[PDB]
Write a structure and sequence with these properties.
part of a larger assembly; 7 chains; A alpha/beta (529); B mainly alpha (196); C alpha/beta (526); D mainly alpha (172); E mainly alpha (93); F mainly alpha (193); C: 526 residues; alpha/beta; mini-chromosome maintenance (MCM) complex, chain A, domain 1; 6-stranded mixed sheet; 5-stranded parallel sheet; 15 helices; 24 strands; 31% helix; elongated; F: 193 residues; mainly alpha; 3-stranded antiparallel sheet; 6 helices; 47% helix; globular; binds adenosine-5'-diphosphate; binds magnesium ion; binds zinc ion; DNA-binding
DNA sequence: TTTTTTTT
């Protein structure tokens, strides 16, 4: 017998050391590189193995559980031969497969597929935490003190009951110190929503991965998997055994700026009407609402957050308020183009955390109707935005407020806004008809905005400073003769920062102050309503 | 501090150098940062005024031996630092311009400063002067890739009509393939008309 | 064995190399001895923190062995340390218990762990059986508990003492045959034994769960956590919600399904970190050096230093100098007397300001919070009367600690206190006044220290304080609570073009602030 | 180093902690306050290009170079413990070249030895990575991230060399 | 089996009709959802008579039905005014 | 600038190729240019012309490699395999390598490039099974790379001694080794006062 | 979700697959409809397992206006309590 | 689930 196993090992060694296409021992080179990066594991294409010799592939398919360990041993031997000079150690290598053949729907799997190399796909619903699997053990005999060890595989053993040099029923014991172990995860997979039959629950199934296949994906990720349909005697029906799958290999269905991106952003900055182009670009379907587009730009751009030496911080996240579905579409577009966003109109294993708003950080948080939103009362939002805050909310995100139906929260929010062209309505109807029967790409704005906010950090120019001081004091005096306070001044300053950040100017300009006050007035006039 | 503007300029220079190097294909150089250079020059002029006033005070002799010593030395050092920064940026742009000239001109003007444009024109004149005269037999602008292949089959990437040759004429017809010696059509390939 | 003794003598040489270790050992020994002397009525534990870099330099081989194979190097190292201590120690007239104590010396390490430094999520099976350190926040701290290690027994009718030691995975780095854990009942000869407690030695066993830093926690992932077996002095060195870095030997346990009794055998071996030393991570308690104390003393020499310190506070905020001084005094607190008869004399200050919206009073409280050594931040609506003082929790039914209970000797602050529910306000009354909290709900009578200082904020009854209308009209709080509370600071906005411009320039310069390292356009991170 | 060497200029731009040994007036602008006069023992961190010369001139030099954090005892301890794991990029972008500049400024032999070690050790793994051509791994990605600017440049060069070798060799 | 096909040529009249409805909603509230409902119910009309091609009559019935479902809004407020406005759109033919 | 950066401090594989083709090689002409005592002539400059005008069918001779390849592109020439390119020779070199881990084998300075060229455009001539030859060459490459890494372990300012390292490997490793040596020397010199 | 062990079960809305969902007597049900009407699918993170269930089914509703005899005065929406989004969808 | 003081 052992001779036949050695023969199979030799055959696989020959396959690895000989399988060549054109003028490259693809597998030899791949193994050498993977060793070079210490990634002691090889990936093999099934088609290639078949091409080398159908017989080995068929034998593998017949008894994968035993054939695979032999193949991994062959990989180990080849690695030693190519990476360590002979007559002059490495761990067991993980073997990765890719059949790329016809799949089997999760539901279809049954007894027929038992112990067969299966090929399928789904979406991973959850991911366990890694556990220890003893590749190698150090074993002491309890009474005669006879040393020994065991080399176990993650396929298809228990501590021997016999002395092997009465001594006892199980005199052997584990020496954790000398023993060696690996990682092993557990993943659960549900059939593709489409694959789900009519009005049926989506089926689910559990897997295990190890070695380098560990931590390769995250929950809620469409993926295609190859493994042996396996069954284990769960401690949790007569002769009923729990079915699982041993993950042979994984492929990701879904799977920083370079020179080109920064160049493109620089050129965008070169454009004088870049800001106007943006405003034209946000929710083009939402014609009009120019001030709304401007405020959207500002909020998306945030502001120059600053931490004073005393520690007190200057917020940089602007928060805008809007006042039917027109605003709903606006916020939907904002979240679409937003690098990070949280859209919710107020509707909103032993661990509890803060509400949905708490999880939001960076990016933006949008709500179609505050007038409708009252969950957790306004005060939660009051704190979460004014203070950016065991129960502390360590989050920092701009809030895009909006409410079609008709104070303290108004004082909280920076900008305030509201909202017939029949021809655009005809055009929209014709667009709906077609679907049923300047310009800039959303991804481009996403990349540009994130890049700018990552690299720029504008500062009010001193001349802008005097202009702002004069404007604020003048507004307050005009109010006296007839309220604007430091809150509004901070809002205006942050708007100016946003404008400069759009222009990428490291310093601001009185142009930015002028435009920012113009916009803020729009909130003021709406505040009048 | 005065050196901050030079630091920004040299950062831009490094960014454009990496821009060119990373991109295998030749890339038009970025816009000249005329604003930054002007600001640094204004700083240098202010330092010049400060040095002149410092010499005036030395004639007033207000602790000149030490105070004027140190102030003059530090002003000179800052000015030298700015000089080096500007020189490095300009030299990098010059070298990339030379690379462009050798690569294609021998075979984005708005981005170039008028001085840079004049310099590039002069460099092209110099190169054509070199390839003309002694050593003309070899085409210095010629490809630096060794001519391993005597004959190459080529498909016209872009139709441009018939073209002349020393002893023949090539009819450039979209999706038409030619089997001709590499050397004869290397210039056309560099011009992008010909494929493979 | 021979390798073990060789390592013992090698570590002896290492100790000889750095007398500082031996000097510290002698300080410990002498300190404990003098403490025992003249005890009118704490003892330093036998433990040393050997600098890892010192080992790396003195003998890189031994250092690497410790880092990689602690189970084979740390044991002999601590053995050598204990032997050096004992030989060097006088151990005069040891008590009978001290004779049987065999109290050894432990080892510990400081910094410079390199790759061995890790995080609960970044931990990996490969690191098993290797000395490593990780950082995280403590959770689910198990209670202290004794643990038998020796069972000193007296053989009655023979006048002799027969002890037996005990082995456990946690106790010993190396694997050993498990002890039966049975008290020696009868002498091997046949003479009945007697369990001589006290003479028999026990240790303190604790189990804690350190979880990955939530800041590090990746999105859509429950932070991984690992357990640490704190022992002896290491026990009770922390508590839940403690961000800490620990050093220990990441070790494996159990059968992981390998046992025959296991049927599925789809499980993995248990793993633990036998923490050898723990380094608490506040990022708190400020530190002082003689030079700093002298600076403070000289500073007191300054006459108006009070004013200077007050101005130093809330430097970003402007105009509330008097409130700044009040906050200063509050932070200083005062003297809380307590009569021998039992009477309690509040010595703490409370500060509260009724201010217009955007007055920065909330921002001022934020500053007081961050600057404070130990503060409690909350708000009217966001707070609860039980949540503020205490809530009886079903757990035996326990009593949840409210804000007041927290930071009992520290400070507390409330935003929009006027908006606080009046029921919870009367709940506060007793806390603040008596400086203590008592609860007798759910059949659970309790009393708690509640001397934490409180600094609330509020807006007037009408949003804008109408100076014409009475403060009682402008203040929704009962005068009892107001009189209960200490210092009322009514702050009102005013359109003083000069003052308006003053604050405008203040805020403008504030926003113009520049981090010395950073420049224009460079995002962060008298 | 070349006078027009971009990396050299940028490294020289980096500033170091320093302290004055004279109270020169009309130099408070160094403290961003031109009105104020510089004072003796004034702890100021200054650009390398400037700080160097200031140290040279003065006899008592006008300024002293304080031991920078990048050459703190902690840093050398970390280097000796584990060169590869060290994130040289985090401590500084141009750590190497600046270390050479320091050694030139002060003949600190031990520092040179430590730097030479670090260099060789990290270069070993750098070569390993560059040679491991993909027929962007996370391991080599993090190694690159810890990689310094000069290390990054050398890695790019070596990787390109290997890529050309493979390309010409396996393919016509 | 029946999968109605919308009549783009008729869908032009649908567009102008929806524009008229929008104008009257501004006079005293339509949405693209109303247009989609009209299309869906026209498809349903086609299906009831096993028509895989939506006809103008499907759209007429859809228009009438959706206009009525709009009329149910604001009875005492505007019902009469809406009736006068849409007597031709919903009932006229 | 007259020279691309990637060519500034090394030779690309193509230059290595060219310099290799500058060499001569055994060949078996399938033409008889030699005119009998009983016409186009080569008359080259950079290489011999005497032989070229004396080609005789199936008569071994030397010609610069690139001419041989030009003819081989035609059916009119056959490229004689170099003796070192033989299963026996490759096996002997492999055994020597395993015997002397410290030292490299005495392969031709141009063994890798020459083997690649012949494999690509001379598969027919090779007497031995071509696949075996490719495999053995690959194994030699692997062993030499391993020894290269081992030698790199001892990189030092003083000097290096590659000995029998092949030209292709030398060109491959030029940039890394040179740069590392430069930095190490810079550091040590800076240490010097 | 209940032990089977640990298993989940679907909901009536999910059970409706292209099938009319008869309902009347118009809380949690309201938000469930909200998510349903916005997209004919049912998101769920029960047991910390985020997922969705595509119902893709027709819906039929009925109720008593404002829990009393219909009132011609005030619009139909005012005659009921359903949120305008619900009405429009 | 159902019943159930008790607190929140
Ligand atoms: N006198 C002042 N000095 C500095 N900042 C002020 C002053 N008055 C108001 N502000 C600014 O107004 C902002 C809002 O203040 P806030 O804390 O909301 O006041 P309130 O708690 O009264 O609503 C703060 O960030 C603060 O910086
Ligand atoms: Mg406030
Ligand atoms: Zn035995």
């Amino acid at each position: 017998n052992d001779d036949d196993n050695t023969e199979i090992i030799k055959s696989f060694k020959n396959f690895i050391l000989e399988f060549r296409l054109d003028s490259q021992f693809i597998y030899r080179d791949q193994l050498r590189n993977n060793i070079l990066v210490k990634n002691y594991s090889l990936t093999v294409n099934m088609e290639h193995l078949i091409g080398y010799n159908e017989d080995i592939y068929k034998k593998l398919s017949d008894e994968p559980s035993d054939i695979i360990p032999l193949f991994e041993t062959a990989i180990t031997q080849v690695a030693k031969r190519i990476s360590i000079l002979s007559r002059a150690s490495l761990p067991t290598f993980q073997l990765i497969l890719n059949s790329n053949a016809n799949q089997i729907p999760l539901r279809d799997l049954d007894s027929e597929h038992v112990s067969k190399i299966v090929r399928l796909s789904g979406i991973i619903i959850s991911t366990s935490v890694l556990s220890s699997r003893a590749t190698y053990l150090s074993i002491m005999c309890r009474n005669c003190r006879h040393t020994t060890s065991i080399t176990i595989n993650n396929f298809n053993v228990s501590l021997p009951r016999s002395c092997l040099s009465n001594c006892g029923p199980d005199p052997y014991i584990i020496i954790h110190e000398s023993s060696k172990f690996i990682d092993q995860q557990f993943l659960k997979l549900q059939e593709i929503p489409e694959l789900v039959p009519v009005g049926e629950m989506p089926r689910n199934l559990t897997m295990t991965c190890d070695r380098y296949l560990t931590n390769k994906v995250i929950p809620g990720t469409r993926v295609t998997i190859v493994g042996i349909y396996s069954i284990y005697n769960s401690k949790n029906g007569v002769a009923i055994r729990t079915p699982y799958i041993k993950i042979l290999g994984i492929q990701s269905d879904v799977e920083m700026f370079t020179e080109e991106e920064e160049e493109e952003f620089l050129q965008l900055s070169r454009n004088p009407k870049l800001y106007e182009i943006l405003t034209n670009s946000i929710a083009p379907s939402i014609f009009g609402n120019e001030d709304i587009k401007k405020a959207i730009v500002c909020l998306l751009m945030g502001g120059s957050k600053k931490i004073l030496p005393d520690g007190m911080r200057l917020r940089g996240d602007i928060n805008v308020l809007l006042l039917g579905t027109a605003k709903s579409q606006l916020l939907k577009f904002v979240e679409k183009v937003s690098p990070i966003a949280v859209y919710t109109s107020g509707k909103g294993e032993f661990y509890l955390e803060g509400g949905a708003m708490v999880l939001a950080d960076g990016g933006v948080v949008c709500i179609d109707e505050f007038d409708k939103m009252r969950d957790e009362d306004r005060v939660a939002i009051h704190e979460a935005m004014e203070q950016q805050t065991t129960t502390v909310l360590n989050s920092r995100t701009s809030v895009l407020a909006a409410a079609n139906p008709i104070t303290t929260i108004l004082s909280r929010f920076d900008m305030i806004f509201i909202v017939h062209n029949e021809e655009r309505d005809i055009s929209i109807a014709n667009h709906v008809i077609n679907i049923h029967t300047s310009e800039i790409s959303i991804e481009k704005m996403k990349r540009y905005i994130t890049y700018c906010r990552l690299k720029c950090a504008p500062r009010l120019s001193p001349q802008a400073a005097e202009k702002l001081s004069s404007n604020f004091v003048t507004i307050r005096k005009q109010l006296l003769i007839n309220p604007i306070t430091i809150r509004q001044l901070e809002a205006i300053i942050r708007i100016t920062e946003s404008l400069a950040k759009l222009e990428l100017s490291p310093i601001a300009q009185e142009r930015h102050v002028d435009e920012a006050i113009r916009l803020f007035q729009a909130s003021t006039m709406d505040a009048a309503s | 501090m005065y050196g901050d503007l030079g630091n920004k300029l040299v950062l831009e220079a490094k960014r454009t150098k990496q821009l060119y190097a990373r991109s295998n294909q030749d890339v038009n150089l970025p816009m000249y940062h005329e604003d930054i250079i002007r600001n640094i020059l204004k700083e240098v002029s202010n330092l010049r005024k400060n040095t002149e006033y410092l010499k005036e005070q030395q004639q007033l002799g207000m602790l000149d031996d030490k105070v004027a010593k140190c102030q003059y030395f530090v002003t000179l050092l800052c000015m030298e630092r700015n000089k080096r920064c500007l020189l490095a940026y300009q030299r990098l742009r010059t070298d990339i311009l030379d690379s462009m000239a050798w690569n294609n001109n021998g075979l984005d003007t708005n981005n170039l400063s008028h001085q840079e444009q004049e310099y590039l024109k002069e460099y092209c004149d110099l190169i054509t002067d070199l390839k003309s005269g002694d050593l003309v037999d070899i085409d210095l602008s010629g490809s630096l890739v060794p001519p391993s292949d005597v004959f190459i089959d080529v498909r016209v990437l872009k139709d441009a009509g018939e073209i002349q040759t020393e002893y023949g004429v090539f009819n450039l017809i979209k999706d038409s393939q030619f089997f001709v010696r590499q050397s004869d059509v290397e210039r056309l390939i560099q011009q992008g008309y010909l494929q493979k | 064995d021979a390798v073990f003794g060789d390592r013992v003598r090698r570590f002896q040489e290492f100790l000889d190399t750095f007398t500082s270790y031996r000097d510290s050992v002698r300080s410990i020994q002498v300190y404990n001895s003098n403490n025992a002397a003249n005890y009118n009525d704490n003892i330093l534990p036998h433990r040393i923190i050997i600098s890892l870099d010192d080992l790396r330099e003195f003998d890189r081989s031994f250092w690497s062995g410790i880092l990689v194979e602690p189970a084979y190097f740390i044991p002999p190292a601590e053995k050598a340390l204990t032997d050096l201590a004992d030989s060097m120690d006088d151990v005069p007239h040891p008590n009978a218990s001290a004779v049987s104590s065999r109290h050894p010396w432990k080892l510990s390490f400081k910094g410079s762990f390199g790759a061995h430094a890790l995080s609960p999520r970044t931990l990996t099976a490969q690191h098993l059986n290797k000395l490593v350190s990780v950082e995280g926040i403590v959770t689910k701290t198990s209670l202290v508990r004794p643990k038998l290690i020796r069972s000193v027994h007296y053989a009655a009718k023979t006048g002799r003492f027969h002890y037996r030691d005990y082995t456990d995975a946690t106790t010993t780095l190396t694997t050993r045959i498990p002890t039966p854990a049975i008290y020696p009942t009868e002498d091997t000869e046949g003479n009945k034994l007697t369990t001589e407690y006290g003479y028999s030695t026990f240790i303190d066993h604790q189990r804690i769960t350190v979880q990955e830093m939530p800041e590090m926690a990746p999105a859509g992932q429950l932070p991984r956590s690992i357990d640490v077996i704190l022992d002896d002095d290491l026990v009770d060195k922390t508590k839940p919600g403690d961000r800490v870095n620990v050093v220990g030997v990441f070790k494996s346990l159990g059968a992981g399904g390998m046992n025959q009794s296991n049927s599925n055998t789809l499980i993995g071996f248990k793993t633990l970190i036998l923490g050898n030393t723990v380094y608490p991570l506040h990022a708190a308690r400020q530190m002082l050096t003689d030079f700093d104390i002298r600076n403070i003393n000289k500073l007191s020499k300054k006459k108006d230093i009070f004013d200077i310190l007050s101005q130093s506070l809330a430097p970003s905020i402007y105009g509330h100098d008097h409130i700044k001084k009040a906050i200063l005094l509050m932070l200083m607190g005062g003297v809380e007397k307590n009569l021998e008869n039992g009477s309690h004399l509040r010595g703490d200050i409370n500060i509260l300001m009724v201010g217009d919206p955007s007055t920065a009073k909330s921002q001022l409280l934020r500053f007081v919070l961050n600057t404070a050594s130990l503060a409690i931040a909350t708000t009217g609506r966001g707070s609860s009367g039980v949540g503020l003082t205490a809530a009886v929790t079903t757990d035996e039914r326990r009593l949840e600690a409210g804000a007041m209970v927290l930071a009992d000797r520290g400070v507390v602050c409330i935003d929009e206190f006027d908006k606080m529910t009046d029921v919870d306000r009367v709940a506060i009354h007793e806390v603040m006044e008596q400086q203590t909290v008592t609860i007798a709900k759910a059949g659970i009578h309790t009393t708690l220290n509640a001397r934490c200082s409180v600094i609330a904020a509020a807006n007037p009854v009408f949003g804008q304080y109408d100076v014409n209308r009475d403060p009682h009209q402008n203040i929704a709080l009962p005068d009892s609570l107001l009189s209960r509370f200490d210092l009322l600071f009514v702050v009102t906005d005013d359109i003083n073009e000069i003052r308006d411009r003053s604050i405008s320039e203040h805020v403008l310069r504030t926003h113009r602030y520049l981090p010395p390292g950073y420049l224009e356009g460079e995002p962060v991170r008298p | 180093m070349g006078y027009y060497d971009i990396d050299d200029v940028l490294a020289d731009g980096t500033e170091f902690p320093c302290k004055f040994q004279y109270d020169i007036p009309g130099l408070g602008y160094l403290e961003n306050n031109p009105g104020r006069p510089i004072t003796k023992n004034t702890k100021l961190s200054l650009p390398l290009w400037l700080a160097r010369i200031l140290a040279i001139v003065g006899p008592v030099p006008f300024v002293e170079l304080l031991p920078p954090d990048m050459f703190s005892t902690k840093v050398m301890n970390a280097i000796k413990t584990d060169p590869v794991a060290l994130d040289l990029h985090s401590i500084n972008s141009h750590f190497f070249s600046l270390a050479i500049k320091w050694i030139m400024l002060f003949s600190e032999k031990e520092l040179a030895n430590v730097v030479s070690e670090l260099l060789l050790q990290r270069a070993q793994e750098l070569n390993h990575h560059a040679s491991s051509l993909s027929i962007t791994n996370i391991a080599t990605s993090t190694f690159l991230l810890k990689l310094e600017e000069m290390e990054k440049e050398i890695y790019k060069k070596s990787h390109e060399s290997y890529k050309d070798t493979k390309r010409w060799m396996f393919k016509k | 089996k029946i999968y109605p096909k919308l009549h783009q040529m008729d869908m032009d009249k649908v567009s102008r009709v929806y524009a008229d409805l929008r104008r009257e909603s501004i006079s005293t509230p339509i949405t693209v959802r109303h247009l989609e409902s009209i299309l869906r119910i026209a498809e349903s009309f086609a299906k009831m008579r096993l028509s895989e091609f939506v006809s103008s009559y499907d759209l007429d019935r859809a228009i009438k039905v959706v206009v009525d479902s709009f009329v149910d809004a604001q009875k005492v407020s505007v019902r009469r005014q809406l009736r006068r406005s849409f007597a031709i759109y919903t009932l006229g033919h | 600038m007259s020279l691309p950066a990637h060519l500034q401090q090394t030779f690309s594989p193509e230059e290595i190729q060219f310099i290799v083709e500058n060499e001569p090689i055994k060949i078996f002409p399938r033409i008889t240019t030699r005119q009998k005592i009983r016409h186009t002539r080569w008359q080259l400059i950079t290489t011999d012309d005497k032989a070229l005008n004396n080609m005789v069918a199936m008569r071994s001779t030397e010609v610069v490699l690139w001419i041989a390849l030009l003819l081989k592109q035609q059916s009119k020439c056959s490229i004689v395999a170099p003796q070192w390119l033989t299963t026996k020779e490759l096996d002997r070199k492999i055994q020597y390598e395993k015997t002397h881990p410290d030292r490299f084998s005495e392969l031709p300075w141009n063994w890798l490039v020459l083997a690649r060229i012949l494999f690509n455009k001379a598969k027919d001539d090779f007497h031995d099974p071509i696949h075996e030859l490719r495999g053995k060459i690959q194994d030699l490459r692997e062993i030499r790379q391993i020894k290269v890494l081992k030698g790199l372990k001892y990189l030092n300012e003083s000097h290096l001694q590659l000995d029998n390292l092949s030209l292709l490997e030398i060109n491959e490793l030029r940039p890394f080794i040179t740069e590392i040596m430069d930095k190490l020397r810079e550091i040590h010199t800076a240490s010097l006062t | 979700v209940r032990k089977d062990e640990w298993t989940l079960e679907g909901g009536a809305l999910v059970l409706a697959d292209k099938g009319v969902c008869l309902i009347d007597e118009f809380d949690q049900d309201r938000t469930s409809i909200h998510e349903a009407m916005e997209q004919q699918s049912i998101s769920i993170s029960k047991a910390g397992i985020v997922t969705t269930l595509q119902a893709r089914c027709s819906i039929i509703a009925a109720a008593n206006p404002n829990g009393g005899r219909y009132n011609s005065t005030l619009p139909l929406a005012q005659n009921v309590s359903l949120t305008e989004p619900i009405l429009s969808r």
